[PDB]
Amino acid sequence: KLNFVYSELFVKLIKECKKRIHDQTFLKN
Amino acid sequence: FVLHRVLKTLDRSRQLEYRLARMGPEEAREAYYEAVLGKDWKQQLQADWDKALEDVDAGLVTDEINHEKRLMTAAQLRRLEVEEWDKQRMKNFYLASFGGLRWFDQMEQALHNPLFIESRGWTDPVQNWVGQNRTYMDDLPAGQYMAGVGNAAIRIKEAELKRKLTDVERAHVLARGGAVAGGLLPQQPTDPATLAVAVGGAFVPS
Amino acid sequence: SGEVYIGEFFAGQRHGCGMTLDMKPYFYLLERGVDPVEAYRRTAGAIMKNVEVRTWYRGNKLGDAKEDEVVEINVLKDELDDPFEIALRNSLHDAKLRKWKAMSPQDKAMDRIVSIIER
Amino acid sequence: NAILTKLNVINQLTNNE
Amino acid sequence: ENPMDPRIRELMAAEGMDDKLEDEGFKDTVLGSAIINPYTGLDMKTYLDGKERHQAELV
Amino acid sequence: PGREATYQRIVGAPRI
Amino acid sequence: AGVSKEDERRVEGLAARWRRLLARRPGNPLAANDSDTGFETESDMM
Amino acid sequence: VLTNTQATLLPTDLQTKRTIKPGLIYTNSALRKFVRNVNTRLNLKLLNSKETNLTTKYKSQFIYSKRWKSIFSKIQPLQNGTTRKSYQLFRNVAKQILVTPDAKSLKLITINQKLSLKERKLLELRTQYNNNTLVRP
Amino acid sequence: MNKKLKKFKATNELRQWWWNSFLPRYLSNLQVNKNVSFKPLSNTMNQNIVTESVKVETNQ
Amino acid sequence: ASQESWRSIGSAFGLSGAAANGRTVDGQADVGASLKAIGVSASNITLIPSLKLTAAKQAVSQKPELSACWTGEAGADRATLLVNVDPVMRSVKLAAAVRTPGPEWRKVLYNDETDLLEYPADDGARHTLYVQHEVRGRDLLHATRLGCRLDLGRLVNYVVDFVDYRIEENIPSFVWNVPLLPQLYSLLVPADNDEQVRHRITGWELDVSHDFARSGLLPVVAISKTSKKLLGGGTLTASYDAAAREAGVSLSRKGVSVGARVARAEGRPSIHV
Numbered sequence: 001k002l003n004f005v006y007s008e009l010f011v012k013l014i015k016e017c018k019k020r021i022h023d024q025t026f027l028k029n
Numbered sequence: 030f031v032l033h034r035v036l037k038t039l040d041r042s043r044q045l046e047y048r049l050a051r052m053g054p055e056e057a058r059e060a061y062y063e064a065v066l067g068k069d070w071k072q073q074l075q076a077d078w079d080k081a082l083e084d085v086d087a088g089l090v091t092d093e094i095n096h097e098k099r100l101m102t103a104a105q106l107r108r109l110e111v112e113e114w115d116k117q118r119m120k121n122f123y124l125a126s127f128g129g130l131r132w133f134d135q136m137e138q139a140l141h142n143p144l145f146i147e148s149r150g151w152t153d154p155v156q157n158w159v160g161q162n163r164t165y166m167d168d169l170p171a172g173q174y175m176a177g178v179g180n181a182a183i184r185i186k187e188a189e190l191k192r193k194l195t196d197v198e199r200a201h202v203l204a205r206g207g208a209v210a211g212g213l214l215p216q217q218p219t220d221p222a223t224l225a226v227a228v229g230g231a232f233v234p235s
Numbered sequence: 236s237g238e239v240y241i242g243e244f245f246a247g248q249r250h251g252c253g254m255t256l257d258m259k260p261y262f263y264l265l266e267r268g269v270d271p272v273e274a275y276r277r278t279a280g281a282i283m284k285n286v287e288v289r290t291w292y293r294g295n296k297l298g299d300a301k302e303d304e305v306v307e308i309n310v311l312k313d314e315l316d317d318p319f320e321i322a323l324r325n326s327l328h329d330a331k332l333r334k335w336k337a338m339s340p341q342d343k344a345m346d347r348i349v350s351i352i353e354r
Numbered sequence: 355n356a357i358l359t360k361l362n363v364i365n366q367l368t369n370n371e
Numbered sequence: 372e373n374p375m376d377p378r379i380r381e382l383m384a385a386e387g388m389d390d391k392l393e394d395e396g397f398k399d400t401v402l403g404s405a406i407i408n409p410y411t412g413l414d415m416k417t418y419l420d421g422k423e424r425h426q427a428e429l430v
Numbered sequence: 431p432g433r434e435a436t437y438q439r440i441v442g443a444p445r446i
Numbered sequence: 447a448g449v450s451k452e453d454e455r456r457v458e459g460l461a462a463r464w465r466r467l468l469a470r471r472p473g474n475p476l477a478a479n480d481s482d483t484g485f486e487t488e489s490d491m492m
Numbered sequence: 493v494l495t496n497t498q499a500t501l502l503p504t505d506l507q508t509k510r511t512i513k514p515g516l517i518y519t520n521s522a523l524r525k526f527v528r529n530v531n532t533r534l535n536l537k538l539l540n541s542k543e544t545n546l547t548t549k550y551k552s553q554f555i556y557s558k559r560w561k562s563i564f565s566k567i568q569p570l571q572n573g574t575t576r577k578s579y580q581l582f583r584n585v586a587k588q589i590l591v592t593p594d595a596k597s598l599k600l601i602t603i604n605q606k607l608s609l610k611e612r613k614l615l616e617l618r619t620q621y622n623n624n625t626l627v628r629p
Numbered sequence: 630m631n632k633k634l635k636k637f638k639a640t641n642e643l644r645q646w647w648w649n650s651f652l653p654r655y656l657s658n659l660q661v662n663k664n665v666s667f668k669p670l671s672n673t674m675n676q677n678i679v680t681e682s683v684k685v686e687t688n689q
Numbered sequence: 690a691s692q693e694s695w696r697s698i699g700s701a702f703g704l705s706g707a708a709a710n711g712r713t714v715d716g717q718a719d720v721g722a723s724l725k726a727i728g729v730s731a732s733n734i735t736l737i738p739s740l741k742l743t744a745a746k747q748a749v750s751q752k753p754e755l756s757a758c759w760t761g762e763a764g765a766d767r768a769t770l771l772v773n774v775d776p777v778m779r780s781v782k783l784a785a786a787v788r789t790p791g792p793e794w795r796k797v798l799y800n801d802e803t804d805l806l807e808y809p810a811d812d813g814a815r816h817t818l819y820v821q822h823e824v825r826g827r828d829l830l831h832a833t834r835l836g837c838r839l840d841l842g843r844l845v846n847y848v849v850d851f852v853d854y855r856i857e858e859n860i861p862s863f864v865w866n867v868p869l870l871p872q873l874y875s876l877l878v879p880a881d882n883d884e885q886v887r888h889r890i891t892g893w894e895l896d897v898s899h900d901f902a903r904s905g906l907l908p909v910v911a912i913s914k915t916s917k918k919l920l921g922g923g924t925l926t927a928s929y930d931a932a933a934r935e936a937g938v939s940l941s942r943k944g945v946s947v948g949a950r951v952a953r954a955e956g957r958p959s960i961h962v
Binding site for chain 10: 568570580618
């Protein structure tokens with residue numbers, strides 16, 4: 001069963017974005 | 030009109046595509062050869078074979094040239110590496126001595142690691158880099174006993190004439206002797222016929 | 236364990252051609268009070284069917300990362316280039332040999348130095 | 355030498371063209 | 372495929388940069404006094420660091 | 431337990 | 447060599463626009479003789 | 493002196509006019525030079541406006557992974573409200589971030605097998621060989 | 630300007646990593662022969678087992 | 690030749706010889722006796738039978754007419770070009786026929802377990818987008834009888850494949866919450882299985898017998914069902930003419946016809962047998 005897959009992607013993608021692009025401490029460093 | 034133009038173009042493209050290298054199954058491939066090279070493909074292939082044979086006979090063998098190229102490359106590379114290694118050791122030695130940090134002394138000691146030198150292959154002779162071993166072919170005696178085809182004859186003729194032959198005379202004699210045999214006689218260690226000659230010249234008459 | 240390996244070794248690891256057998260069932264039956272002839276009769280076929288022949292590189296088994304097809308794939312890749320590049324490369328290959336055949340040793344040394352500098 | 359080889363190939367191509 | 376966190380990576384990059392600055396300062400204060408080539412003012416530090424072409428262009 | 435099963439797995443035939 | 451720049455431009459156009467547009471160094475990875483080698487590149491297979 | 497395996501690989505029956513020194517290296521060098529000469533002649537002949545007679549420009553083939561396509565086909569995102577909402581959120585985020593303007597669609601690029609041209613052509617040649625020149629062997 | 634350029638580069642790297650690394654592995658883990666081809670005999674006065682196997686492979 | 694969608698010349702060219710083969714509101718009795726030129730072919734079915742007799746030699750005028758046929762097929766496409774010149778008319782008429790030109794919607798699939806490509810092996814070739822363009826003299830658009838003989842599965846599958854992959858994502862969300870709309874979308878466009886068709890539409894056809902010679906646009910639509918259930922084969926065609934006012938139910942099997950020309954009450958059909 002693959003009903004959940006998209007959800008497991010979304011909670012990943014934005015989270016990864018938070019780590020890689022819109023992180024203010026990383027930008028400061 | 031638009032529909033008429035589309036239909037005519039489609040029909041013309043379908044008709045033309047059929048008569049474009051689509052003969053396919055004919056039980057033979059000579060049509061492919063005649064298409065790619067023309068009618069006289071056999072003559073061109075024969076010319077290519079003749080050119081390859083001529084190039085090989087001229088001495089332009091890839092292996093015998095690449096071997097020397099790589100040998101010289103390794104020879105230069107060893108020196109070019111061992112000089113930079115010396116400079117890097119000297120810098121760290123001066124930093125450790127005139128300074129007061131043990132880290133540079135440990136760096137120099139690490140640069141002085143025998144395993145690193147063995148892996149770099151600086152101690153090994155350059156020949157071992159290419160794959161062969163250093164041979165001292167001049168240490169073995171050069172006399173009539175196990176002399177080779179040309180050398181034994183030259184020495185016999187010199188003994189008969191009671192005087193050593195010069196360089197030009199030796200070169201001319203060797204050239205004529207090689208030419209009269211077609212040049213097929215072995216002349217280098219990698220030639221397959223060296224062992225037969227060595228075995229033949231291994232018995233001294235009583 | 237029953238593993239039997241016959242073949243080439245380099246340093247302290249398998250490197251070269253080798254043959255592998257798994258005689259575990261024969262030893263298992265031998266250790267349980269069965270005479271060797273009966274155990275061999277019972278377990279000869281299975282052991283003979285599972286004989287493996289392999290090529291090992293530095294202790295690793297080859298044949299799972301398409302090591303066999305590398306040369307043909309590279310030949311096809313070389314053939315996939317444009318005709319002008321292939322022709323120029325093939326002409327340069329002969330030109331280099333013809334030039335090296337007649338050079339002086341000092342010229343050869345300078346050429347090799349230039350090649351090293353370029354590399 | 356490299357330029358000469360390239361020019362020879364160019365001449366060979368231009369012969370037909 | 373499990374990479375290091377970008378914040379730690381950037382922080383360590385900055386720390387490595389200041390460490391390189393400290394190393395350059397120590398090397399200068401130790402070896403820069405000597406003269407290798409008096410015609411171009413080539414000191415021992417640049418000579419042993421392999422930056423002779425830097426001096427050649429600077430002149 | 432697990433004695434006949436390992437014989438079946440290794441030898442390939444049931445024990446007599 | 448009797449080769450004008452127009453000929454070179456024509457050949458380049460033929461190669462790029464007519465042939466290249468129509469459709470890691472080249473060589474055998476497992477080669478004994480390699481001209482320029484450096485004796486450092488390592489083959490992980492045989 | 494060619495072994496029968498070497499002889500059967502030559503395209504035709506060729507005549508030898510020179511006596512070559514015995515050894516394997518000379519024979520292999522002759523074969524390599526013959527192959528290079530044949531390839532050079534073929535390429536030069538083809539480039540001399542021979543493509544005018546035969547020009548088959550085949551490209552733009554798009555390869556799609558079977559496993560990924562089946563997996564995303566078995567997913568039903570529209571029969572339920574929650575799945576539809578989650579799919580809408582993910583689609584918005586992906587189209588904002590992941591999808592390049594050169595891509596035809598998010599669903600198409602999702603199942604697309606990203607392959608370079610050379611890999612695609614090698615796969616085509618390999619499949620042709622599995623299903624089925626002068627000096628290639 | 631440097632902050633925005635770094636953000637742009639991070640976005641490009643994130644896109645490349647997502648399309649090339651994460652999703653194939655995720656799908657492969659979500660879903661879930663040749664060794665037989667490596668065995669010649671798998672499909673079908675005194676000597677030991679090794680000699681007989683070698684002879685059968687030689688016949689093969 | 691041998692396409693859906695005179696004939697004596699083509700039969701003779703098929704094989705400078707003589708051939709005879711035997712087998713309509715009145716029977717068609719399609720029989721061809723070619724000799725080249727004898728062109729015996731039964732037609733003009735209405736008793737007072739009448740035959741279109743015209744002696745020709747294989748503009749001068751009994752009246753020799755010249756027919757040239759060029760046939761070349763590449764892959765699925767098969768091209769037939771016919772040029773007919775009649776001396777009395779003094780105008781040349783063209784004829785074009787192309788078979789299986791149908792656009793493809795399937796895609797190649799890479800298989801990693803076998804590490805091989807899998808082309809769209811579904812190549813049943815039932816698709817036939819015949820295009821017949823006839824030009825007579827100055828009038829280039831004399832006739833355009835573009836009627837596809839495809840199973841219609843090609844067209845419906847292409848449409849649903851285009852809608853599913855490229856249009857569904859751009860559809861706004863608020864229209865989806867409409868009740869029973871998702872069910873309609875699912876029924877119309879189902880999920881794909883392997884590379885096969887979403888809807889298995891086979892046997893049907895849409896033969897548009899349009900002709901630009903007629904005033905304005907008055908095409909003739911003929912839906913043809915070709916199944917083996919009906920007496921082991923035979924096309925059952927329902928053709929509706931916008932001008933002739935005749936709904937033709939034709940059961941044709943190897944020249945055997947049961948034709949019922951049905952006319953609407955001039956509700957209450959009137960049947961011609």
